[PDB]
Design an enzyme around this catalytic site. Structure first.
Site, PDB file in Angstrom:
ATOM      1  N   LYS B 157       0.892  -1.042   0.203  1.00 44.85           N
ATOM      2  CA  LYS B 157       0.048  -0.019   0.003  1.00 44.85           C
ATOM      3  C   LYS B 157       0.867   1.240   0.081  1.00 44.85           C
ATOM      4  CE  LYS B 157      -2.200  -1.374   3.752  1.00 44.85           C
ATOM      5  NZ  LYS B 157      -2.014  -2.885   3.632  1.00 44.85           N
ATOM      6  N   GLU B 183       0.280   4.663  11.542  1.00 40.29           N
ATOM      7  CA  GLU B 183       1.020   3.999  10.760  1.00 40.29           C
ATOM      8  C   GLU B 183       2.476   4.370  11.224  1.00 40.29           C
ATOM      9  OE1 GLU B 183       1.620   1.928   7.588  1.00 40.29           O
ATOM     10  OE2 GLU B 183      -0.221   1.405   8.134  1.00 40.29           O
ATOM     11  N   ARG B 184       3.711   3.671  10.913  1.00 42.06           N
ATOM     12  CA  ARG B 184       4.734   3.582  11.561  1.00 42.06           C
ATOM     13  C   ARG B 184       5.463   5.261  11.593  1.00 42.06           C
ATOM     14  NH1 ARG B 184       4.312  -0.616   8.114  1.00 42.06           N
ATOM     15  NH2 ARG B 184       5.031  -2.638   8.974  1.00 42.06           N
TER      16      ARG B 184
HETATM   17  N1  LIG Z   1       6.109  -1.690  -6.228  1.00 41.16           N
HETATM   18  C1  LIG Z   1       6.753  -2.665  -5.552  1.00 41.16           C
HETATM   19  N2  LIG Z   1       7.719  -3.405  -6.076  1.00 41.16           N
HETATM   20  C2  LIG Z   1       8.449  -4.455  -5.419  1.00 41.16           C
HETATM   21  N3  LIG Z   1       8.097  -4.727  -4.216  1.00 41.16           N
HETATM   22  C3  LIG Z   1       7.174  -3.829  -3.350  1.00 41.16           C
HETATM   23  C4  LIG Z   1       6.594  -2.730  -4.025  1.00 41.16           C
HETATM   24  N4  LIG Z   1       5.622  -2.497  -3.229  1.00 41.16           N
HETATM   25  C5  LIG Z   1       5.817  -2.968  -2.015  1.00 41.16           C
HETATM   26  N5  LIG Z   1       6.913  -3.989  -2.180  1.00 41.16           N
HETATM   27  C6  LIG Z   1       7.389  -4.916  -1.274  1.00 41.16           C
HETATM   28  O1  LIG Z   1       6.581  -4.873   0.067  1.00 41.16           O
HETATM   29  C7  LIG Z   1       7.382  -4.394   1.014  1.00 41.16           C
HETATM   30  C8  LIG Z   1       6.429  -3.659   2.057  1.00 41.16           C
HETATM   31  O2  LIG Z   1       5.303  -2.868   1.033  1.00 41.16           O
HETATM   32  P1  LIG Z   1       4.572  -1.744   1.984  1.00 41.16           P
HETATM   33  O3  LIG Z   1       4.489  -0.566   0.630  1.00 41.16           O
HETATM   34  O4  LIG Z   1       5.097  -1.236   3.280  1.00 41.16           O
HETATM   35  O5  LIG Z   1       3.241  -2.235   2.120  1.00 41.16           O
HETATM   36  P2  LIG Z   1       2.072  -1.948   3.256  1.00 41.16           P
HETATM   37  O6  LIG Z   1       0.848  -2.760   2.939  1.00 41.16           O
HETATM   38  O7  LIG Z   1       1.953  -0.282   3.227  1.00 41.16           O
HETATM   39  N6  LIG Z   1       2.825  -2.349   4.706  1.00 41.16           N
HETATM   40  P3  LIG Z   1       1.997  -2.525   5.954  1.00 41.16           P
HETATM   41  O8  LIG Z   1       1.694  -1.161   6.587  1.00 41.16           O
HETATM   42  O9  LIG Z   1       3.008  -3.310   6.911  1.00 41.16           O
HETATM   43  O10 LIG Z   1       0.719  -3.178   5.729  1.00 41.16           O
HETATM   44  C9  LIG Z   1       8.342  -3.821   0.689  1.00 41.16           C
HETATM   45  O11 LIG Z   1       9.261  -3.670   1.649  1.00 41.16           O
HETATM   46  C10 LIG Z   1       8.710  -4.484  -0.555  1.00 41.16           C
HETATM   47  O12 LIG Z   1       9.554  -5.508  -0.130  1.00 41.16           O
HETATM   48 MG   LIG Z   2       2.622   0.477   5.323  1.00 41.00          MG
END
Ligand SMILES: Nc1ncnc2c1ncn2[C@@H]1O[C@H](COP(=O)(O)OP(=O)(O)NP(=O)(O)O)[C@@H](O)[C@H]1O
Ligand SMILES: [Mg+2]
Ligand SMILES: Nc1ncnc2c1ncn2[C@@H]1O[C@H](COP(=O)(O)OP(=O)(O)NP(=O)(O)O)[C@@H](O)[C@H]1O
Ligand SMILES: Nc1ncnc2c1ncn2[C@@H]1O[C@H](COP(=O)(O)OP(=O)(O)NP(=O)(O)O)[C@@H](O)[C@H]1O
Ligand SMILES: [Mg+2]
Ligand SMILES: [Mg+2]
Lengths: 53, 469, 483, 484
Positions: B157, B183-184
């Site tokens: 996300k 969030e963080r």
């Molecule tokens: N566009 C992308 N391409 C490749 N890997 C990705 C991409 N987006 C996310 N990732 C992988 O996913 C991990 C976490 O993505 P993140 O954008 O933090 O998702 P999130 O859902 O916001 N995290 P959370 O708050 O823990 O749910 C990253 O550290 C990457 O390893």
């Molecule tokens: Mg996140």
């Protein structure tokens, strides 16, 4: 010879089908158990909420 | 000459306060308590009767004593509005948390406001090009519209939202508001640095973005309100300065979650799955304010955490109706390495209409979805019995679907550290023409891996010719 | 009969004492009961205070006296705790006498905001081949250790705490990494045996154990990680670096739900209370890397989560996944096979580590990450063809697989890691039998230790490789293979 | 004198516990001193539970509460046509006062066992699939059910639009007046819909009653019932009204909020014990009235949302057992190209061919069953099986009949346009045409009949049946067009 070749292919085919079919069964059983447990918890919550008042 | 009362009960985020005589503070009014640190601010949630009010606190209630003195402020939580907030980092209670001193704004508006009426609505249908293939082709975002990024934990996300900040905020021309909700704290910090290093914020010049933070380290009261703070700032720009506001929120799920942590303590009989009975009306009061009116427009992007990967959970479930475009990121897809992990079949837009995007774009998008759907309809036959049991018709539709799927991936500029490949932004017309061609069976003699993690069609051929040698 | 510093118990049951009076009490203030057992003032109402017991309900009776402390739940902190084992309240339990404390932090302390922080750039070198090459941990980072039961979760934390033997022996302060191990819901016997190992490897002198074992009052288990956080924080706050291991958060969240249910808080998903996310989030937020202006201290957290039947989709796992900066997922399937560490490559990520991993490993592990996430893929599709091109990559895959098996209590320095990775990625192992790769390692180490010790010295001191040094290892490896 | 007024004892989450009011009727309207209106639902001994129709930011403990002496009612009449009002019928489009012919209460009894006549008059939707397979009658209640984003509104809307063909005539009994109820939808979405209704010259015979996401739970709860009374004016006075409750999923959620905060001990999934009655009494109000009552009718299309195709869920199950048949939309069909995404297997209209144009009934002989035979046949195809003269012949036709039922949005067809296409499909005349060309066959075969055979269509739009002569005339006219 074609016969023989087919029977030995069908065997190997079924052998992996059974392997995948069986591997899927594990993942679904795991899903089942979660969903079973979840059904017990959620019914128990309704009943507890209902008695709470 | 004010109005004071005493603290009569403390339970977590809930403080009951009794008032001596004839005038009790109105529901939603901020109250204050002197601490040897600063002030603890309380918001009036309800009237208990017998001259007591129940409040949600905005910070930890450690150390509060029964019978302590509480002062009515005579109004709700107020925040600095107007251009004077750009380049600053702001509390839920409208305090500067960037050590850059006072945010000397001219006006300070309340964070609770009635949502824009029905006659004040301003409906339109202009495509907001994102430069991201899946979105642009299958679920295009709308200018002045609302956009949700649904996702389980760590599926992408925030990276998606950072890509769009990077792709769209820089050269937008109007102001932005980023609200960090539950969030963080680290991610906040991480973004602040980025705004300086890209020049969206200039410490010593002009700034394009206001920052508001209520991260997952704050109490539920703080997390339950921080979105309204960020929202109030955005509403000024839209209404008073007539601006085209960009309002990013990450993560909006956390506003509902926070609400549920206090709900029991406010003495409400819990609703389904433990959530507050007020789930949808709380969501309406916030969500219906994030809107384009006649005075100005608000394009918004909102992260939506999906708890236990369950899309049917009341929280995310309720959110869907509030958005003009949804992009659903799927753990299943992400674990295949297909990034961004967009579900090309469960993401949706209002604007996928033959009138808005034109017949050709629409037709390509439809045929792409059809093909992706056939493959999905077969996943189980493919999984158990494999490719050899399919009719040669399906064999072909699958093989093509498998290419399209990869072609929907894209190296993000912000995700450079995980791809190892420099990011690509692809243009809508180049996206539309590329997929149209794959449909027309002009690239079937090409390996799948060539379609993975590239830009438009010209890079596919490039990767294909390179991977020959 | 003071009713401001003192109260009488009205009722006690389900881990809650209801007390009359204590008029001047603070929220979350610690109390002391007739019997000596302590408690926390959780909710203050007209006419009574609800107190959560830090011991057995037995120990409190209706009518008994309850005494104020004028202390929000807090703990002894400082450098005097190194080498000690304490309980959740900081009570000495190793039998080693009074705790030498520099002061007392609160159990609940707010995490540093947006400003006092800085991006991770310093590595926590685990000494684990699989970890440090694939999912590297920075000082200040939060990485989650997660997998089924009996899958070597602890062994990854442990061999990390062990590995710090290298630096905590030297003078260099900034490179010293003090350890805090938090045992929550574990068996007493286990923790005692574990402490036995930490002493056996000398590592006990720089680590602090905080334990709320399996039979202890639930609220003492709920509290442990927080007070352990306070202790870990002293080092962060003062300019040094501490590592904190929460073994495990699953059991903590279980302890937490107990209280909530007994308190009559609405159950939600899996009967956990609504605020169970907050429980964890406020904790792991305290793991941070501080800015120049605050001494540059770092708290690093390694929470352990236990999945059930490998399901990472459960409520608690996804919660902690959504708080941490990545997770090292340990697959039960690999663990039973012998592949240990049992790291699942695709499912594991560090979110901030790369920019903090030692540059030397970074080069020799060129795309190692994305590759092993793809060999594993083509391997399952192999069992229709004995193909030519993908057949060599499979041998590369298997040689890199067998190369990443590592013994417990055998952590290696970065300088030992770099050549091992060089020999795999660059295909020097592809001519060797599968069952001989383990023997190759220490023999290849023997060779580098008694001949090419001059390359090994260089890597340690730089943290990089020069073009000159790259061509140096090139020659060294190839000579060994043919003998 | 605490008979006509009371005083707020406690206030929160849109609920007010009020002392006094010792004469208040149950379900009576109240004004608060601060302006905000509310509804007395709990007449307890000590106090009164009252749920507010506005914000509670302005209610305060001690504040005075006034009776109205009125059970909640609404303005009704033809004056509402072309307007947009709220749950209480206050105008919200900013066009001035509502012109009211009278006032019905919000909660009215349904017409009982006597004042009714069996349904027999088509509501033409203009949707080839609906009209042919699940035809809908005046007085009927057909349920539109499916997951989010499956075309649920799009099915109700095309129907509303399609009534243009009669609403511009002078004939009254043929007209169908439209009432659309937005419950829990966001405002921008309702705006966008009336923006469509305007553009198709369709607003002038529609009334929009909307209680949106932001509004107090009792407003969302109440909105369908008040919208009903608005529709009932037409039914009661010899006219016809269609009402669309979009959607009742959201209404029930609101009703649950009321109940929980009023502290009425909940039932299953936290809903009220009588959450079925909530809907059952509402949808029983849609009816075809008897002659002695002027033959007027109200036709209901309630919408229901499922989660993950769970039709077996609690509230879905209720409403299915209330209505006279269901249109079932499936995302899986949406993405196979089938739009409207109607599941023929699961979809029914119990009124049946009693409310379908005889011409269309004739051409759709066994079409619904035929398609069942088709999907049974296409199930055996997956087995990688080669078929015979009977099994290939039917597989081929069904695949074409499916394609024929695909339909663009906002483009409803006339029966005289529909009848031919179905005739061409079921009688074999499409079986040897490339499947990608069935769309182009439509507008070309239509164009062809409009010019050359315009006497054929006029005969259908006015006689509504097919004499043996028309069938022979059509048989030839089709065969003719097959070779261009
Ligand atoms: N566009 C992308 N391409 C490749 N890997 C990705 C991409 N987006 C996310 N990732 C992988 O996913 C991990 C976490 O993505 P993140 O954008 O933090 O998702 P999130 O859902 O916001 N995290 P959370 O708050 O823990 O749910 C990253 O550290 C990457 O390893
Ligand atoms: Mg996140
Ligand atoms: N690299 C390794 N090679 C061989 N055995 C190992 C390795 N690492 C750990 N083990 C052993 O495997 C067993 C289980 O590993 P352990 O480190 O206890 O994981 P865990 O997930 O904490 N199990 P538990 O705490 O009981 O859920 C222990 O007896 C370890 O000593
Ligand atoms: N016959 C059709 N052909 C092509 N597209 C259609 C058709 N009918 C509807 N759509 C599109 O499908 C999408 C969803 O249809 P809609 O009528 O909004 O369903 P819905 O059930 O109201 N979704 P929601 O209200 O969000 O639960 C919209 O983009 C429509 O334009
Ligand atoms: Mg363990
Ligand atoms: Mg709809």
């Amino acid at each position: 010879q074609g016969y023989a070749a087919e029977i030995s292919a069908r065997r190997n085919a079924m052998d992996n089908a059974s392997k995948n079919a069986g591997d899927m069964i594990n993942r679904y059983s795991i899903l089942y158990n979660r969903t079973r447990q979840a059904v017990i918890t959620n019914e128990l919550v309704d009943t507890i909420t209902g008695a709470s008042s | 000459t004010p109005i004071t009362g005493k603290v009569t009960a403390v339970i977590g985020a809930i403080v009951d306060v009794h008032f001596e005589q004839s005038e009790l503070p109105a529901i939603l009014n901020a109250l204050e308590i002197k601490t040897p640190q600063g002030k603890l601010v309380l918001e009036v949630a309800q009237h208990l009767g017998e001259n007591t009010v129940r409040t949600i606190a905005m910070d930890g209630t450690e150390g509060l004593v029964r019978g302590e003195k509480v002062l009515d402020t005579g109004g709700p939580i107020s925040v600095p509005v107007g251009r004077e907030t750009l380049g600053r980092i702001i509390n839920v209670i409208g305090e500067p948390i960037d050590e850059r001193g006072p945010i000397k704004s001219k006006l300070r508006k309340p964070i609770h406001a009635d949502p824009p009426s029905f006659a004040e609505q301003s409906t339109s249908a202009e495509i907001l090009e994102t430069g991201i293939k899946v979105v642009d082709l299958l679920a295009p975002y709308a200018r002045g519209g609302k956009i949700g990024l649904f996702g389980g934990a760590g599926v992408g996300k925030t990276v998606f939202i950072q890509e769009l900040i990077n792709n769209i905020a820089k050269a937008h021309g109007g102001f932005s508001v980023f609200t960090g909700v539950g969030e963080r704290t680290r991610e906040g910090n991480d973004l602040y640095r980025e705004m300086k290093e890209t020049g969206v914020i200039n410490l010593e010049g002009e700034s394009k973005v206001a920052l508001v933070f209520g991260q997952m380290n704050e109490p539920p009261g703080a997390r339950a309100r921080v979105a309204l703070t960020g929202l109030t700032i955005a509403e000024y720009f839209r209404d008073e300065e007539g601006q085209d506001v960009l309002l990013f929120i990450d993560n909006i799920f956390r506003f509902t979650q926070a609400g549920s942590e206090v709900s029991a303590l406010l003495g409400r009989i819990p609703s389904a799955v433990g959530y507050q009975p007020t789930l949808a009306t709380d969501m309406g009061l916030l969500q219906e304010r994030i809107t384009t009116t006649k005075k100005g427009s608000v394009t918004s992007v909102q992260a939506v955490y999906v708890p236990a990967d369950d899309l049917t959970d009341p929280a995310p479930a309720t959110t869907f109706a509030h958005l003009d475009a949804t992009t659903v990121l799927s753990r299943g897809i992400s674990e295949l390495g297909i990034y961004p992990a967009v579900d090309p079949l469960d993401s949706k837009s209002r604007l996928l209409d033959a009138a808005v995007v034109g017949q050709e774009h629409y037709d390509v998008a439809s045929k792409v979805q059809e093909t992706l759907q056939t493959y999905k309809s077969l996943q189980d036959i493919i999984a158990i019995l494999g490719m050899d049991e399919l009719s040669e018709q399906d064999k072909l539709t699958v093989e093509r679907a498998r290419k399209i799927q990869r072609f929907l991936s894209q190296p993000f500029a912000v995700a450079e550290v995980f791809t190892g490949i420099p990011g690509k932004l692809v243009r809508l017309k180049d996206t539309v023409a590329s997929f149209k061609a794959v449909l027309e069976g002009k690239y079937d003699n090409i390996p799948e891996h060539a379609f993975y993690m590239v830009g438009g069609i010209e890079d596919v051929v490039a990767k294909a010719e390179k991977l020959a040698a | 009969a003071n009713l401001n510093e003192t109260g009488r118990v009205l009722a006690v049951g389900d881990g809650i004492a209801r007390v009359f009076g204590l008029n001047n009490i603070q929220a979350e203030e610690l109390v002391e009961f007739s019997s000596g057992v302590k408690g926390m003032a959780l909710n203050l109402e007209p006419g009574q205070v609800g107190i959560v017991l830090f011991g057995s309900d037995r120990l409190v009776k209706e009518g008994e006296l309850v005494k104020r402390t004028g202390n929000i739940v807090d703990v002894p902190v400082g450098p005097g705790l190194l080498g000690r084992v304490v309980d959740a309240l900081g009570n000495p339990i190793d039998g080693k006498g009074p705790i030498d404390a520099a002061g007392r932090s609160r159990a609940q302390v707010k995490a540093p905001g947006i400003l006092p922080r800085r991006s991770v750039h310093e590595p926590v070198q685990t000494g684990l081949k699989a970890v440090d090459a694939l999912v590297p941990i920075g000082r200040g980072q939060r990485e989650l250790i997660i997998g089924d039961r009996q899958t070597g979760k602890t062994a990854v934390a442990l061999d990390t705490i062990l590995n710090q033997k290298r630096w905590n022996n030297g003078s260099d302060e900034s490179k010293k990494l003090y350890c805090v191990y938090v045992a929550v819901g574990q068996k007493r016997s286990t923790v005692a045996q574990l402490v036995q190992t930490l002493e056996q490897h000398d590592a006990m002198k720089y680590s602090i154990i905080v334990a709320a074992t399996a039979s202890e009052a639930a609220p003492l288990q709920y509290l442990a990680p927080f007070t352990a956080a306070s202790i870990g924080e002293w080092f962060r706050d003062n300019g040094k670096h501490a590592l904190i291991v929460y073994d495990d958060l699953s059991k903590q969240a279980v302890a937490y739900r107990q209280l909530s249910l007994l308190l009559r808080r609405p159950p939600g998903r899996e009967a956990y209370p609504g605020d169970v996310f907050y429980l964890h989030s406020r904790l792991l937020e305290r793991a941070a890397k501080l800015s120049e202006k605050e001494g540059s201290g770092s708290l690093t957290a390694l929470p352990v989560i236990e999945t059930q039947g490998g399901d990472v989709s459960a409520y608690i796992p996804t919660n902690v996944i959504s708080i941490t900066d990545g997770q090292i997922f340990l697959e039960a399937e690999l663990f039973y096979k012998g592949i240990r560490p049992a790291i699942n490559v695709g499912l594991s990520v560090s979110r901030v580590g790369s920019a903090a991993q030692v540059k030397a490993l970074k080069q020799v592990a060129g795309s190692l990450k994305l590759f092993l996430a793809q060999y594993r893929e083509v391997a399952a599709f192999a069992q229709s063809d004995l193909d030519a091109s993908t057949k060599q990559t499979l041998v590369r895959g298997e040689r890199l697989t067998q190369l990443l098996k590592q013994n417990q209590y055998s952590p290696l320095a970065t300088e030992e890691q770099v050549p091992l990775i060089y020999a795999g990625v660059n295909g020097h192992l592809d001519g060797i039998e599968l069952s001989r790769i383990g023997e190759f390692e220490s023999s290849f180490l023997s060779y580098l230790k008694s001949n090419h010790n001059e390359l090994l010295t260089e890597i340690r001191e730089k943290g990089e490789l020069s073009k000159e040094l790259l061509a140096s290892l090139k020659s060294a490896t190839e000579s060994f293979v043919a003998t």
